[PDB]
Amino acid sequence: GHGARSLLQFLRLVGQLKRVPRTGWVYRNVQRPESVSDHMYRMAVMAMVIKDDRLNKDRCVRLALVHDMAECIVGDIAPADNIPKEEKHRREEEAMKQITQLLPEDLRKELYELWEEYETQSSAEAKFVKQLDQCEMILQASEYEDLEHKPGRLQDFYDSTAGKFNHPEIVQLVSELEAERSTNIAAAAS
Protein backbone atom coordinates (compact mmCIF):
# COMPACT_ATOMS: atom_id res chain seq x y z
CA GLY A 1 0.00 0.00 0.00
CA HIS A 2 2.79 2.45 -0.86
CA GLY A 3 0.32 4.48 -2.92
CA ALA A 4 -2.05 4.93 0.02
CA ARG A 5 0.83 5.58 2.39
CA SER A 6 2.28 8.27 0.11
CA LEU A 7 -1.10 9.93 -0.31
CA LEU A 8 -1.58 9.96 3.46
CA GLN A 9 1.86 11.53 3.93
CA PHE A 10 0.86 14.13 1.33
CA LEU A 11 -2.38 14.94 3.16
CA ARG A 12 -0.54 15.25 6.51
CA LEU A 13 1.83 17.77 4.97
CA VAL A 14 -1.18 19.65 3.59
CA GLY A 15 -2.74 19.48 7.06
CA GLN A 16 0.27 21.37 8.42
CA LEU A 17 -1.14 24.45 6.62
CA LYS A 18 -3.83 24.57 9.32
CA ARG A 19 -1.07 25.09 11.87
CA VAL A 20 0.88 27.75 10.02
CA PRO A 21 -0.43 31.12 11.22
CA ARG A 22 -0.30 33.88 8.61
CA THR A 23 2.92 35.70 9.52
CA GLY A 24 1.89 39.31 8.98
CA TRP A 25 -0.87 38.97 11.58
CA VAL A 26 1.48 37.34 14.09
CA TYR A 27 4.04 40.12 13.58
CA ARG A 28 1.29 42.62 14.35
CA ASN A 29 0.11 40.91 17.57
CA VAL A 30 -3.26 39.84 16.18
CA GLN A 31 -4.97 37.52 18.68
CA ARG A 32 -5.89 34.11 17.23
CA PRO A 33 -4.63 34.82 13.69
CA GLU A 34 -5.95 32.88 10.64
CA SER A 35 -4.03 29.93 9.18
CA VAL A 36 -2.61 29.73 5.65
CA SER A 37 -5.40 27.30 4.77
CA ASP A 38 -8.06 29.85 5.99
CA HIS A 39 -6.53 32.39 3.59
CA MET A 40 -6.61 29.95 0.66
CA TYR A 41 -10.16 28.85 1.43
CA ARG A 42 -11.61 32.37 1.16
CA MET A 43 -9.57 33.04 -1.98
CA ALA A 44 -11.04 29.93 -3.60
CA VAL A 45 -14.55 31.10 -2.65
CA MET A 46 -13.76 34.53 -4.10
CA ALA A 47 -12.73 32.92 -7.39
CA MET A 48 -16.12 31.16 -7.45
CA VAL A 49 -18.24 34.28 -6.86
CA ILE A 50 -16.37 36.99 -8.73
CA LYS A 51 -17.62 37.12 -12.31
CA ASP A 52 -15.32 37.23 -15.33
CA ASP A 53 -16.28 35.18 -18.35
CA ARG A 54 -12.87 35.80 -19.94
CA LEU A 55 -11.37 33.62 -17.19
CA ASN A 56 -11.27 29.86 -16.67
CA LYS A 57 -12.85 29.76 -13.20
CA ASP A 58 -11.86 26.15 -12.51
CA ARG A 59 -8.23 27.09 -13.14
CA CYS A 60 -8.60 30.14 -10.86
CA VAL A 61 -10.00 28.03 -8.00
CA ARG A 62 -7.20 25.45 -8.33
CA LEU A 63 -4.50 28.16 -8.45
CA ALA A 64 -5.95 29.64 -5.25
CA LEU A 65 -5.82 26.23 -3.50
CA VAL A 66 -2.23 25.48 -4.57
CA HIS A 67 -0.49 28.87 -4.55
CA ASP A 68 0.66 28.89 -0.86
CA MET A 69 0.93 25.10 -0.55
CA ALA A 70 4.74 25.21 -0.25
CA GLU A 71 4.24 26.95 3.11
CA CYS A 72 3.59 23.60 4.81
CA ILE A 73 7.36 23.05 4.59
CA VAL A 74 8.86 26.50 4.13
CA GLY A 75 6.56 28.35 6.52
CA ASP A 76 4.91 31.67 5.64
CA ILE A 77 7.78 33.98 4.65
CA ALA A 78 7.04 37.68 5.18
CA PRO A 79 8.73 40.82 3.78
CA ALA A 80 9.97 41.52 7.33
CA ASP A 81 11.92 38.25 7.21
CA ASN A 82 14.30 39.82 4.68
CA ILE A 83 14.59 36.73 2.45
CA PRO A 84 15.81 37.51 -1.09
CA LYS A 85 13.04 36.84 -3.64
CA GLU A 86 15.23 34.33 -5.50
CA GLU A 87 16.00 32.48 -2.28
CA LYS A 88 12.31 32.37 -1.41
CA HIS A 89 11.53 30.99 -4.86
CA ARG A 90 14.28 28.37 -4.57
CA ARG A 91 12.99 27.20 -1.19
CA GLU A 92 9.40 27.05 -2.38
CA GLU A 93 10.22 25.28 -5.63
CA GLU A 94 12.26 22.67 -3.76
CA ALA A 95 9.41 22.22 -1.25
CA MET A 96 6.86 21.80 -4.07
CA LYS A 97 9.04 19.12 -5.65
CA GLN A 98 9.17 17.25 -2.32
CA ILE A 99 5.42 17.58 -1.78
CA THR A 100 4.30 16.57 -5.28
CA GLN A 101 6.65 13.58 -5.47
CA LEU A 102 4.23 11.89 -3.04
CA LEU A 103 1.57 11.89 -5.79
CA PRO A 104 0.94 9.67 -8.88
CA GLU A 105 2.79 11.14 -11.88
CA ASP A 106 -0.22 12.81 -13.57
CA LEU A 107 -1.19 14.63 -10.36
CA ARG A 108 2.43 15.36 -9.47
CA LYS A 109 2.79 17.09 -12.84
CA GLU A 110 -0.55 18.89 -12.55
CA LEU A 111 -0.05 20.26 -9.05
CA TYR A 112 3.49 21.36 -9.78
CA GLU A 113 2.50 23.10 -13.03
CA LEU A 114 -0.30 24.98 -11.24
CA TRP A 115 2.17 26.31 -8.68
CA GLU A 116 4.55 27.20 -11.51
CA GLU A 117 1.73 29.03 -13.33
CA TYR A 118 1.04 31.15 -10.25
CA GLU A 119 4.73 31.89 -9.67
CA THR A 120 5.16 32.92 -13.31
CA GLN A 121 2.34 35.50 -13.31
CA SER A 122 1.81 35.34 -17.07
CA SER A 123 -1.64 33.82 -17.49
CA ALA A 124 -4.71 35.97 -16.91
CA GLU A 125 -5.86 33.46 -14.27
CA ALA A 126 -2.54 33.71 -12.39
CA LYS A 127 -2.68 37.53 -12.35
CA PHE A 128 -6.31 37.40 -11.23
CA VAL A 129 -5.47 35.06 -8.32
CA LYS A 130 -2.59 37.36 -7.29
CA GLN A 131 -5.13 40.16 -6.99
CA LEU A 132 -7.45 37.87 -4.99
CA ASP A 133 -4.54 37.16 -2.67
CA GLN A 134 -3.98 40.86 -1.98
CA CYS A 135 -7.69 41.63 -1.74
CA GLU A 136 -8.33 38.78 0.71
CA MET A 137 -5.46 40.05 2.84
CA ILE A 138 -6.66 43.66 3.10
CA LEU A 139 -10.19 42.43 3.75
CA GLN A 140 -8.81 40.29 6.58
CA ALA A 141 -6.83 43.31 7.87
CA SER A 142 -10.00 45.38 8.19
CA GLU A 143 -11.78 42.49 9.92
CA TYR A 144 -9.05 42.30 12.57
CA GLU A 145 -9.19 46.10 13.04
CA ASP A 146 -12.96 45.86 13.53
CA LEU A 147 -12.69 42.93 15.96
CA GLU A 148 -10.11 44.85 17.94
CA HIS A 149 -12.01 48.15 17.84
CA LYS A 150 -8.77 49.74 16.60
CA PRO A 151 -9.59 51.27 13.22
CA GLY A 152 -6.57 52.08 11.08
CA ARG A 153 -4.17 49.98 13.16
CA LEU A 154 -3.16 47.78 10.22
CA GLN A 155 -2.64 50.65 7.75
CA ASP A 156 0.80 49.31 6.70
CA PHE A 157 -0.97 46.43 4.88
CA TYR A 158 -3.09 48.87 2.85
CA ASP A 159 -0.08 51.02 1.95
CA SER A 160 1.73 47.94 0.64
CA THR A 161 -1.08 47.18 -1.85
CA ALA A 162 -1.19 50.70 -3.31
CA GLY A 163 -1.60 50.51 -7.09
CA LYS A 164 -1.83 46.71 -7.17
CA PHE A 165 -5.49 46.30 -8.08
CA ASN A 166 -6.82 46.53 -11.64
CA HIS A 167 -9.44 43.83 -12.16
CA PRO A 168 -12.85 45.50 -12.65
CA GLU A 169 -14.70 43.44 -10.04
CA ILE A 170 -11.89 43.38 -7.47
CA VAL A 171 -11.47 47.12 -7.83
CA GLN A 172 -15.13 47.69 -6.88
CA LEU A 173 -14.66 45.47 -3.82
CA VAL A 174 -11.53 47.27 -2.65
CA SER A 175 -13.07 50.71 -3.23
CA GLU A 176 -16.11 49.82 -1.14
CA LEU A 177 -13.88 48.38 1.60
CA GLU A 178 -11.67 51.49 1.60
CA ALA A 179 -14.61 53.91 1.58
CA GLU A 180 -16.10 52.17 4.62
CA ARG A 181 -12.73 51.85 6.36
CA SER A 182 -11.41 55.39 5.72
CA THR A 183 -14.70 56.95 6.77
CA ASN A 184 -14.66 54.90 9.98
CA ILE A 185 -11.09 56.02 10.71
CA ALA A 186 -12.01 59.68 10.14
CA ALA A 187 -15.03 59.39 12.45
CA ALA A 188 -12.98 57.67 15.17
CA ALA A 189 -10.35 60.41 14.86
CA SER A 190 -13.03 63.07 15.36
Added chain:
Amino acid sequence: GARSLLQFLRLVGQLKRVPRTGWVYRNVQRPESVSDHMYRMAVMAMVIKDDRLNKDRCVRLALVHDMAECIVGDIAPADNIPKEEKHRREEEAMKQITQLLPEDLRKELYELWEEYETQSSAEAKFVKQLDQCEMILQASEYEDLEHKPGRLQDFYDSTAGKFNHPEIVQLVSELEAERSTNIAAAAS
Protein backbone atom coordinates in the same frame (compact mmCIF):
# COMPACT_ATOMS: atom_id res chain seq x y z
CA GLY B 1 -23.44 45.00 -6.09
CA ALA B 2 -20.07 45.47 -4.43
CA ARG B 3 -21.38 46.35 -0.96
CA SER B 4 -23.45 43.14 -0.78
CA LEU B 5 -20.60 41.04 -2.18
CA LEU B 6 -18.39 42.51 0.55
CA GLN B 7 -20.99 41.53 3.15
CA PHE B 8 -21.03 38.02 1.65
CA LEU B 9 -17.24 37.75 1.88
CA ARG B 10 -17.25 38.96 5.48
CA LEU B 11 -19.77 36.26 6.34
CA VAL B 12 -17.59 33.68 4.59
CA GLY B 13 -14.70 35.06 6.68
CA GLN B 14 -16.55 34.12 9.87
CA LEU B 15 -15.82 30.48 8.99
CA LYS B 16 -12.19 31.15 9.94
CA ARG B 17 -13.40 31.87 13.46
CA VAL B 18 -15.81 28.97 13.86
CA PRO B 19 -13.80 26.20 15.52
CA ARG B 20 -14.82 22.70 14.52
CA THR B 21 -17.15 21.71 17.35
CA GLY B 22 -16.18 18.06 17.89
CA TRP B 23 -12.61 19.12 18.70
CA VAL B 24 -13.80 21.83 21.09
CA TYR B 25 -16.01 19.30 22.87
CA ARG B 26 -13.00 16.99 23.28
CA ASN B 27 -10.70 19.66 24.77
CA VAL B 28 -8.38 19.80 21.76
CA GLN B 29 -6.06 22.77 22.20
CA ARG B 30 -6.08 25.19 19.26
CA PRO B 31 -8.69 23.37 17.14
CA GLU B 32 -9.01 23.84 13.36
CA SER B 33 -11.64 26.15 11.88
CA VAL B 34 -14.45 25.12 9.54
CA SER B 35 -12.54 26.76 6.68
CA ASP B 36 -9.40 24.66 7.48
CA HIS B 37 -11.65 21.56 7.20
CA MET B 38 -13.10 22.60 3.84
CA TYR B 39 -9.70 23.64 2.49
CA ARG B 40 -8.20 20.17 2.94
CA MET B 41 -11.33 18.50 1.58
CA ALA B 42 -11.02 20.62 -1.57
CA VAL B 43 -7.39 19.51 -1.97
CA MET B 44 -8.48 15.91 -1.44
CA ALA B 45 -11.05 16.28 -4.22
CA MET B 46 -8.17 17.43 -6.43
CA VAL B 47 -5.79 14.54 -5.70
CA ILE B 48 -8.01 11.49 -5.18
CA LYS B 49 -8.57 10.01 -8.62
CA ASP B 50 -11.87 8.93 -10.15
CA ASP B 51 -12.36 10.02 -13.74
CA ARG B 52 -16.06 9.09 -13.57
CA LEU B 53 -16.61 12.00 -11.20
CA ASN B 54 -16.78 15.61 -12.26
CA LYS B 55 -13.77 16.86 -10.27
CA ASP B 56 -14.59 20.55 -10.67
CA ARG B 57 -17.99 19.81 -9.14
CA CYS B 58 -16.41 17.88 -6.24
CA VAL B 59 -14.09 20.78 -5.42
CA ARG B 60 -16.93 23.27 -5.49
CA LEU B 61 -19.14 21.02 -3.34
CA ALA B 62 -16.35 20.72 -0.75
CA LEU B 63 -16.04 24.53 -0.60
CA VAL B 64 -19.77 25.09 -0.13
CA HIS B 65 -20.99 22.10 1.93
CA ASP B 66 -20.39 23.63 5.42
CA MET B 67 -20.80 27.26 4.32
CA ALA B 68 -24.05 27.67 6.32
CA GLU B 69 -21.96 27.32 9.50
CA CYS B 70 -20.82 30.94 9.20
CA ILE B 71 -24.32 31.85 10.45
CA VAL B 72 -25.63 28.82 12.31
CA GLY B 73 -22.33 27.56 13.71
CA ASP B 74 -20.97 24.02 13.47
CA ILE B 75 -23.86 21.91 14.78
CA ALA B 76 -22.73 18.55 16.18
CA PRO B 77 -24.65 15.36 17.01
CA ALA B 78 -23.92 16.27 20.65
CA ASP B 79 -26.08 19.38 20.15
CA ASN B 80 -29.18 17.17 19.79
CA ILE B 81 -30.70 19.17 16.95
CA PRO B 82 -33.24 17.02 15.06
CA LYS B 83 -32.06 16.30 11.52
CA GLU B 84 -35.11 18.10 10.12
CA GLU B 85 -34.45 21.20 12.22
CA LYS B 86 -30.75 21.27 11.36
CA HIS B 87 -31.71 21.24 7.69
CA ARG B 88 -34.36 23.93 8.21
CA ARG B 89 -31.81 26.23 9.89
CA GLU B 90 -29.07 25.62 7.37
CA GLU B 91 -31.48 26.04 4.47
CA GLU B 92 -32.66 29.36 5.93
CA ALA B 93 -29.04 30.47 6.35
CA MET B 94 -28.04 29.50 2.79
CA LYS B 95 -30.99 31.51 1.49
CA GLN B 96 -29.90 34.54 3.53
CA ILE B 97 -26.29 34.12 2.44
CA THR B 98 -26.96 33.62 -1.28
CA GLN B 99 -29.42 36.49 -1.59
CA LEU B 100 -26.36 38.73 -1.20
CA LEU B 101 -25.28 37.54 -4.66
CA PRO B 102 -26.45 38.41 -8.21
CA GLU B 103 -29.28 36.14 -9.48
CA ASP B 104 -27.15 33.70 -11.50
CA LEU B 105 -24.59 33.17 -8.74
CA ARG B 106 -27.28 33.07 -6.05
CA LYS B 107 -29.02 30.24 -7.85
CA GLU B 108 -25.78 28.41 -8.65
CA LEU B 109 -24.38 28.59 -5.13
CA TYR B 110 -27.65 27.61 -3.51
CA GLU B 111 -28.10 24.66 -5.87
CA LEU B 112 -24.58 23.44 -5.08
CA TRP B 113 -25.46 23.40 -1.41
CA GLU B 114 -28.76 21.69 -2.18
CA GLU B 115 -27.02 18.97 -4.26
CA TYR B 116 -24.83 18.16 -1.26
CA GLU B 117 -27.75 18.16 1.19
CA THR B 118 -29.74 15.90 -1.16
CA GLN B 119 -26.90 13.37 -1.53
CA SER B 120 -28.18 12.19 -4.91
CA SER B 121 -25.28 12.88 -7.26
CA ALA B 122 -22.22 10.65 -7.23
CA GLU B 123 -20.17 13.83 -6.60
CA ALA B 124 -22.23 14.71 -3.50
CA LYS B 125 -21.82 11.20 -2.04
CA PHE B 126 -18.12 11.29 -2.76
CA VAL B 127 -17.73 14.66 -0.99
CA LYS B 128 -19.69 13.32 2.00
CA GLN B 129 -17.08 10.55 2.27
CA LEU B 130 -14.25 13.10 1.95
CA ASP B 131 -15.83 14.97 4.85
CA GLN B 132 -15.73 11.94 7.13
CA CYS B 133 -12.31 10.86 5.89
CA GLU B 134 -10.80 14.33 6.49
CA MET B 135 -12.32 14.28 9.97
CA ILE B 136 -10.78 11.00 11.07
CA LEU B 137 -7.45 12.03 9.55
CA GLN B 138 -7.59 15.19 11.67
CA ALA B 139 -8.52 13.10 14.73
CA SER B 140 -5.38 10.95 14.29
CA GLU B 141 -3.29 14.09 13.86
CA TYR B 142 -4.57 15.53 17.13
CA GLU B 143 -3.88 12.22 18.90
CA ASP B 144 -0.33 12.31 17.50
CA LEU B 145 0.26 15.93 18.55
CA GLU B 146 -1.00 15.18 22.06
CA HIS B 147 0.87 11.86 22.24
CA LYS B 148 -2.44 10.33 23.35
CA PRO B 149 -3.08 7.58 20.80
CA GLY B 150 -6.61 6.19 20.86
CA ARG B 151 -8.03 9.20 22.74
CA LEU B 152 -10.39 10.25 19.92
CA GLN B 153 -11.71 6.74 19.14
CA ASP B 154 -15.32 7.99 19.14
CA PHE B 155 -14.75 9.77 15.80
CA TYR B 156 -13.59 6.51 14.25
CA ASP B 157 -16.56 4.59 15.68
CA SER B 158 -18.95 7.17 14.25
CA THR B 159 -17.70 6.53 10.67
CA ALA B 160 -18.00 2.73 10.80
CA GLY B 161 -19.43 1.48 7.50
CA LYS B 162 -19.82 4.96 6.01
CA PHE B 163 -17.04 4.48 3.46
CA ASN B 164 -17.39 2.69 0.14
CA HIS B 165 -15.56 4.64 -2.57
CA PRO B 166 -12.56 2.44 -3.33
CA GLU B 167 -9.91 5.22 -3.20
CA ILE B 168 -11.30 6.61 0.04
CA VAL B 169 -11.61 3.10 1.54
CA GLN B 170 -7.93 2.42 0.76
CA LEU B 171 -6.85 5.67 2.39
CA VAL B 172 -9.01 4.98 5.47
CA SER B 173 -7.69 1.42 5.77
CA GLU B 174 -4.09 2.65 5.67
CA LEU B 175 -4.81 5.38 8.22
CA GLU B 176 -6.54 2.85 10.50
CA ALA B 177 -3.65 0.39 10.28
CA GLU B 178 -1.00 3.04 11.04
CA ARG B 179 -3.02 4.34 13.98
CA SER B 180 -3.81 0.93 15.50
CA THR B 181 -0.11 0.07 15.31
CA ASN B 182 0.62 3.19 17.36
CA ILE B 183 -2.14 2.34 19.83
CA ALA B 184 -0.80 -1.20 20.19
CA ALA B 185 2.70 0.21 20.78
CA ALA B 186 1.39 2.48 23.55
CA ALA B 187 -0.54 -0.39 25.17
CA SER B 188 2.49 -2.65 25.66
